[PDB]
Amino acid sequence: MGKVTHSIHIEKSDADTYGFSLSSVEGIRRLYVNSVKETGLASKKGLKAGDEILEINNRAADALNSSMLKDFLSQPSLGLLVRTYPE
């Protein structure tokens, strides 16, 4: 409903985090960007609070479990497909 979909790719050097958090809800499972650390990697790459996460590493949100999420979010690179409102 008036949103735009786009891809984000982030890499971490060699040991900080991506600087964001995600929230879940029950098309069954849906992932939203909960917070974005003002001075974090995700923020710099254009991730915004309230964005919906459609895919991580090419896998749909509803197909991701906690183990996969934890693994993917801790890897040295991360791909996201996100739906966001233009500013």
Binding site: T17, G19, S21, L22, S23, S24, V25
Partner: peptide, 6 residues
């Protein structure tokens, strides 16, 4: 609902 930190 659960929060995950990256």
């Amino acid at each position: 609902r659960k929060e995950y930190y990256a």
